[PDB]
Amino acid sequence: MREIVHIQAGQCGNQIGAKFWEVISDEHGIDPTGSYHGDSDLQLERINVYYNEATGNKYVPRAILVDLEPGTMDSVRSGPFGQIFRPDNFVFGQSGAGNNWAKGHYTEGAELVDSVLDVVRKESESCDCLQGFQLTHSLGGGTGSGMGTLLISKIREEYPDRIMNTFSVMPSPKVSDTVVEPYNATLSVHQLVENTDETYCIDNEALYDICFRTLKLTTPTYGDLNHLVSATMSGVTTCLRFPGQLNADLRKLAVNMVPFPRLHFFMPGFAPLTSRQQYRALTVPELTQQMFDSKNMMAACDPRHGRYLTVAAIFRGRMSMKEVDEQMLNVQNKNSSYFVEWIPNNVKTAVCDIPPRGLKMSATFIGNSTAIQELFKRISEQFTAMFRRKAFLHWYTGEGMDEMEFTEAESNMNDLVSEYQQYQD
Amino acid sequence: MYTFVVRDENSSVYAEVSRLLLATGQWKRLRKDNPRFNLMLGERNRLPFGRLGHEPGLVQLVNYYRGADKLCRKASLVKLIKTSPELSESCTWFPESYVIYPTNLTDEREVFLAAYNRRREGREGNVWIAKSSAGAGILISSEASELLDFIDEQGQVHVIQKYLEKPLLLEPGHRKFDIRSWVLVDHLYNIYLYREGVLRTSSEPYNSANFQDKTCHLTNHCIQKEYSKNYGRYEEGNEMFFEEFNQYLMDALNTTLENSILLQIKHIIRSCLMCIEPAISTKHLHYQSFQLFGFDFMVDEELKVWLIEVNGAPACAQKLYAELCQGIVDVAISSVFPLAPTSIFIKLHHHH
Amino acid sequence: MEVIELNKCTSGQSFEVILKPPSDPSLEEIQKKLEAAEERRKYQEAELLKHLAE
Amino acid sequence: MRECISIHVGQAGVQIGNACWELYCLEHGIQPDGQMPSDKTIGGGDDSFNTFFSETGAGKHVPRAVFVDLEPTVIDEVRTGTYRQLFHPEQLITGKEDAANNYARGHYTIGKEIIDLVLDRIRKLADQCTGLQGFLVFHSFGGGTGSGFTSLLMERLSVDYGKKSKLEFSIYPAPQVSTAVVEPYNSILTTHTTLEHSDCAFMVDNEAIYDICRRNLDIERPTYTNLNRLISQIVSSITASLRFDGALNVDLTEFQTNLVPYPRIHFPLATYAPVISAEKAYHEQLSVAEITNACFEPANQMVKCDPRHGKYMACCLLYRGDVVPKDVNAAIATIKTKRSIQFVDWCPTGFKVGINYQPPTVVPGGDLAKVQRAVCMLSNTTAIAEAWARLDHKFDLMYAKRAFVHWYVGEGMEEGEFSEAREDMAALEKDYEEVGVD
Ligand SMILES: Nc1nc2c(ncn2[C@@H]2O[C@H](COP(=O)(O)OP(=O)(O)OP(=O)(O)O)[C@@H](O)[C@H]2O)c(=O)[nH]1
Ligand SMILES: Nc1ncnc2c1ncn2[C@@H]1O[C@H](COP(=O)(O)OP(=O)(O)CP(=O)(O)O)[C@@H](O)[C@H]1O
Ligand SMILES: Nc1nc2c(ncn2[C@@H]2O[C@H](COP(=O)(O)OP(=O)(O)O)[C@@H](O)[C@H]2O)c(=O)[nH]1
Ligand SMILES: CCC(=O)Nc1ccc(C)cc1O
Numbered sequence A: 001m002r003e004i005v006h007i008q009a010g011q012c013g014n015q016i017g018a019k020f021w022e023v024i025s026d027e028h029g030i031d032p033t034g035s036y037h038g039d040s041d042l043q044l045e046r047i048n049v050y051y052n053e054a055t056g057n058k059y060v061p062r063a064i065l066v067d068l069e070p071g072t073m074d075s076v077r078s079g080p081f082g083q084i085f086r087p088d089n090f091v092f093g094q095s096g097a098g099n100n101w102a103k104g105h106y107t108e109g110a111e112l113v114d115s116v117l118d119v120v121r122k123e124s125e126s127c128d129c130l131q132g133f134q135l136t137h138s139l140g141g142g143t144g145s146g147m148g149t150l151l152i153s154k155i156r157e158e159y160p161d162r163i164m165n166t167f168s169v170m171p172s173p174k175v176s177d178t179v180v181e182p183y184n185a186t187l188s189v190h191q192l193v194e195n196t197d198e199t200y201c202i203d204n205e206a207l208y209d210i211c212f213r214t215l216k217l218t219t220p221t222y223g224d225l226n227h228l229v230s231a232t233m234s235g236v237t238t239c240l241r242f243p244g245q246l247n248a249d250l251r252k253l254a255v256n257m258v259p260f261p262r263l264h265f266f267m268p269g270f271a272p273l274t275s276r277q278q279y280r281a282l283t284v285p286e287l288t289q290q291m292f293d294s295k296n297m298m299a300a301c302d303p304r305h306g307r308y309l310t311v312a313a314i315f316r317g318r319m320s321m322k323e324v325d326e327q328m329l330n331v332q333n334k335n336s337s338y339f340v341e342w343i344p345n346n347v348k349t350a351v352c353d354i355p356p357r358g359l360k361m362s363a364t365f366i367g368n369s370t371a372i373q374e375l376f377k378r379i380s381e382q383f384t385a386m387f388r389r390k391a392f393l394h395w396y397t398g399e400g401m402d403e404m405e406f407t408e409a410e411s412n413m414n415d416l417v418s419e420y421q422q423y424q425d
Numbered sequence B: 001m002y003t004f005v006v007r008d009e010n011s012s013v014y015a016e017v018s019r020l021l022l023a024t025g026q027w028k029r030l031r032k033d034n035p036r037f038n039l040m041l042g043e044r045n046r047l048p049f050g051r052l053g054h055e056p057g058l059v060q061l062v063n064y065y066r067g068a069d070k071l072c073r074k075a076s077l078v079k080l081i082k083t084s085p086e087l088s089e090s091c092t093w094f095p096e097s098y099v100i101y102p103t104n105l106t107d108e109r110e111v112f113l114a115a116y117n118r119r120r121e122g123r124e125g126n127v128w129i130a131k132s133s134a135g136a137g138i139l140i141s142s143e144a145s146e147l148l149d150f151i152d153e154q155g156q157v158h159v160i161q162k163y164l165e166k167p168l169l170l171e172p173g174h175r176k177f178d179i180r181s182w183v184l185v186d187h188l189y190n191i192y193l194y195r196e197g198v199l200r201t202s203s204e205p206y207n208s209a210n211f212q213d214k215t216c217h218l219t220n221h222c223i224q225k226e227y228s229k230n231y232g233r234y235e236e237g238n239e240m241f242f243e244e245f246n247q248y249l250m251d252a253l254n255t256t257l258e259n260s261i262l263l264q265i266k267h268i269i270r271s272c273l274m275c276i277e278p279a280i281s282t283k284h285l286h287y288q289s290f291q292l293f294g295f296d297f298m299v300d301e302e303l304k305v306w307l308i309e310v311n312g313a314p315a316c317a318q319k320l321y322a323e324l325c326q327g328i329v330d331v332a333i334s335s336v337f338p339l340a341p342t343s344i345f346i347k348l349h350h351h352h
Numbered sequence C: 001m002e003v004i005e006l007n008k009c010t011s012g013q014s015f016e017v018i019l020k021p022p023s024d025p026s027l028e029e030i031q032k033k034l035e036a037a038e039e040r041r042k043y044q045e046a047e048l049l050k051h052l053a054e
Numbered sequence D: 001m002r003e004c005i006s007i008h009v010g011q012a013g014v015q016i017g018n019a020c021w022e023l024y025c026l027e028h029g030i031q032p033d034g035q036m037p038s039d040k041t042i043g044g045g046d047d048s049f050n051t052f053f054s055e056t057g058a059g060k061h062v063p064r065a066v067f068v069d070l071e072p073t074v075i076d077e078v079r080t081g082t083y084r085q086l087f088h089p090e091q092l093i094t095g096k097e098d099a100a101n102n103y104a105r106g107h108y109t110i111g112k113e114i115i116d117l118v119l120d121r122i123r124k125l126a127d128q129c130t131g132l133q134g135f136l137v138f139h140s141f142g143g144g145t146g147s148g149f150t151s152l153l154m155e156r157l158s159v160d161y162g163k164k165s166k167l168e169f170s171i172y173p174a175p176q177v178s179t180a181v182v183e184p185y186n187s188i189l190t191t192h193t194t195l196e197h198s199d200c201a202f203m204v205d206n207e208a209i210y211d212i213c214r215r216n217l218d219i220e221r222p223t224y225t226n227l228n229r230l231i232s233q234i235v236s237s238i239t240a241s242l243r244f245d246g247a248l249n250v251d252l253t254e255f256q257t258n259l260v261p262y263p264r265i266h267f268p269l270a271t272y273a274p275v276i277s278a279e280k281a282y283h284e285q286l287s288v289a290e291i292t293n294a295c296f297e298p299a300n301q302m303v304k305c306d307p308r309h310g311k312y313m314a315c316c317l318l319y320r321g322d323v324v325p326k327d328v329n330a331a332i333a334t335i336k337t338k339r340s341i342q343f344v345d346w347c348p349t350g351f352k353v354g355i356n357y358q359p360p361t362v363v364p365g366g367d368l369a370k371v372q373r374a375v376c377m378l379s380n381t382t383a384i385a386e387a388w389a390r391l392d393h394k395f396d397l398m399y400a401k402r403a404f405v406h407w408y409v410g411e412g413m414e415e416g417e418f419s420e421a422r423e424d425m426a427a428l429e430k431d432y433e434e435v436g437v438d
């Protein structure tokens, strides 16, 4: 009984969180009303990891929906699986955050955080043995970014020895809502450096490029981007949600993926990624070749520009476990220059018999690569282009912040960039 | 795509093999400390055999046979011959040798003197030669007092063996020489002899009444090119190859290189390598070995061949680097890692 | 090649063949290490809480 | 009769313990419910099998064993498995969250809070013994529990049972069946703190067991079940002398006398033959010479290494099945004339031979075939130091960059314990070289 507590915060966080529970609920055979209707016991073996068992054999997600405005969560409550969530687990305000990190972290958000912690504390007091938490949110807005990282700071204070995991959508000027997203993202990153054990970095530009160039979607929508996040979130959590010889909990994964405390930002990937030639069978070599291809990576970072500290690959479906080992060893033994040679056997593989909905097999990629410094360099450059002229700062100083806090965020992330640079050589 | 690592930058041989390997576009060189390799061109001393063959999915190959030092060390070779029944102490192709430890440190001091006093009493030729592995340091003398006293001044194990007082001399010149044979043993323990040998000749007339001047007695390529005044006079670089040497044996001695010399050389090579096969074979091992050997032979005026020593990290003659190194890639490397003749070797069949 | 110390019973036997002759911390100290490490954990967490207090 | 208590720590220890007690029962004629029809003494007796089994008044033969794991998933299989009836609940000790492959977590953070509970359960078994010999401790090198908590247990056992022998069955880490990267840290940390507390340790390298399963048993991708059933055969061959009538290795003390002349060098190499596939049509039964000669082939060693390039300090031959002393001595003579067996000059060149007439028992439906004779050779070779070197080299690679060190320091361990443990291994490697090399 190693329970996980899910928190989704803000527009992006709740919309991506929604699809996530939609994808895995289908995998575990849970219908929109919470009733199970699968045909395999493997669907229920680890069901309590993400679901609470209610009366009448009902399964209720262990999720907390947080936002500073009602809109998005009214959408979820009316969405496909909206009825599946615990009504008391909706915590929201009316003011909004106006895409303002200071509003989510210092003013509007501070007024609502205690009530969110009351629901978090409630879900935890009922866990037989809590592994830790996972948060879905964007860093470019105000609620998921500012209040999300405030939540993390207070959860680490009340649960200092629990694992804190996040799926963090990183802003991109090509898929942007406001010009202040680099401000909000730079401020959040430092919070994550300090108070998360693992952060899956999801770049909206990588999601966009994949939808446009690979999936051949002329005009991607946030919905299309969220399908990729859904599938990816389902992939990285397969080991947690299904039985297998791995027997891995959050702290075991972190212990083998994070050689240095601050360098815990991961590049996720997924394969296959096919446009609608969609019924073709995908061989293990093809699966492996794509999984390691940069075009299948969602951090919009070229791995060949850095080096992998650790890699974790999860294969789903009935396939040749012998044939997997061969192709995995083939990728390593054919590109060993991109793996640090001072971490022996830093590429691990795990299999799972149950494939995602509508796929004979698939592979999810989880990489701790120094190339992720390119992502933080982009953000840092966009931050500095505005901060050097103090552009748009009045939105933040009006909430009680000072320029000094911005200069420190700037320096905190340029230190992070440098830390990745030393381990790349 | 195959991968290899280079851990011996001083090896002129495998510097060429590495060059050839990359020229195939199917071999990729890695940093010298990367464990994920197919082929290791390892160091000479303290090669970590224990770390080989433990990478999942990689067939790993190394260019040194673990345990071959027993054959390529002066004292070790003597001990191996005198203790191994396959060679026995009555081995007819190895000069009467003795292992002598300096008195500042088993040892064959009294056994040597017993045979020495016997030779001195029987009017026989009693000239011995003292040498060691720590040399560039050699002494030739007919008095047992000079040989022993020379070893005590040192601090490493030495070997005293019978000096061939009747060596075969080439004409014109009246000069001594030795024969270098290159032997390649692959992972399956096939023994291949390079068809091309080299004679390292002395450009000075052999003088039996003066072992003090070691320029006409030592045929080392470095001694002739530094202390001899007739270097490069009779043949380029004091190196006579088989084609020339065979034609000489026919005009002068009315015999061939195959009959008069090569049969004894091929016999000695088999006897040495077969002797230690059970000790160094990698047949059922988690990794695979192959090694290039350089045998040094002597020929006396009776056309009898003697073994001088075995070199575990030999060099090649400049003219033979291309043919030999290519041959190494063919039978030793591509035989295990194939790529996408008239062999230059002479396979010495044997029973495994 | 000599066989020595032959012992036989209903379920087997044993013997020795010779081919050639030859030529702590107290309970007090363990608790100190366990408590000293628990003290370094408490100190590190105290600094984490102090950090979150600031 | 003197009792032996078996302790299984962590997942590897527990799953291997499960496979051994399954085999022990099939060997002694004990049924899953604990009954033993051939035991005419009901609820008592000082027979050889009683060293590993106590007896209740109801005729139940209960293993003298304790299972310890910081998380319950693995031990729950024991509670509901085929032999759930053998044990009672006090013997199965489970926490609620494991050590996350973190030595410091198993040894310090979690170990401190559960050690006294485990010692109390062991004390209960001890109180049933009229003459306890000592303990057999099964654990992995890689796990946080098997490494961190085991070393803690060994330190306390030396305090609570000073005069008792302690043997180990340790699983050496192999990447083919592991997703952990920090196992070199854990292995070296646990070897450093356990070294002075273990009288004799039998290391099994998962890489070796893995290759034997794929090569001899034709298992393309062996499972922990395949690995453990083969491991419990070697374990059984080693402990049979304690559970059956005999005169060689009759008590734990004899393992140190016969196999460990130098205390620190207490890691004998195990070699087992024959291992034949059950699915095979029908194999030609190998002779005494052929299986004995197989004991000097690296392919059937529990740790891959080259004994030809080390010196032997001791050598036992443990035969099971149709074997008579005449045949053994004939094969030994034939092997000395063909093999490179170098003994250290300060040790006799010989072989202690034990024969048990009952051939190896195989689990029905298992992977191994029934053979008429089998042998396990226990040899103390300096060649096994290749395993320490491999492991110490991987340690050096990560520790030079302090990779993952923060996870250990964060659980209360001091960084200086890494180097203190490493320097001990450098001294252990130097001992082997001083003994084996000229
Ligand atoms: N041969 C064999 N090896 C195993 C088995 N289970 C785990 N291992 C090995 O043990 C190492 C992992 O350590 P574990 O024993 O699983 O961990 P643990 O002792 O339970 O400690 P925790 O970290 O708290 O889980 C890896 O090298 C595995 O290959 C098993 O059943 N048989
Ligand atoms: N017993 C002996 N009788 C006659 N000459 C001998 C001899 N031992 C050595 N030599 C002479 O010494 C030379 C080889 O010496 P040796 O091989 O022992 O030194 P070395 O090993 O440093 C040279 P290399 O290893 O390059 O072949 C030969 O040319 C030979 O003429
Ligand atoms: N992938 C994805 N990104 C989104 C979505 N909605 C908003 N974003 C991104 O999130 C950032 C805006 O944050 P948002 O969640 O709207 O602000 P918040 O509600 O205050 O937390 C911008 O970078 C958007 O591009 C979504 O549904 N999917
Ligand atoms: C940080 C950006 C920001 O604050 N934006 C913003 C704009 C208008 C109003 C009314 C409120 C707002 O919050």
Ligand SMILES: [Ca+2]
Binding pocket: A111
């Ligand atoms: Ca207000």
Ligand SMILES: [Ca+2]
Binding pocket: D039, D040, D041, D042, D043, D044, D045, D046, D055
């Ligand atoms: Ca009884």
Ligand SMILES: [Ca+2]
Binding pocket: C024, D158, D162, D196, D197
């Ligand atoms: Ca003790």
Ligand SMILES: [Mg+2]
Binding pocket: A011, A012, A141, A177
């Ligand atoms: Mg928005």
Ligand SMILES: [Mg+2]
Binding pocket: B309, B310, B311
């Ligand atoms: Mg030499």
Ligand SMILES: [Mg+2]
Binding pocket: D010, D011, D069, D071, D098, D143, D145
């Ligand atoms: Mg465990």
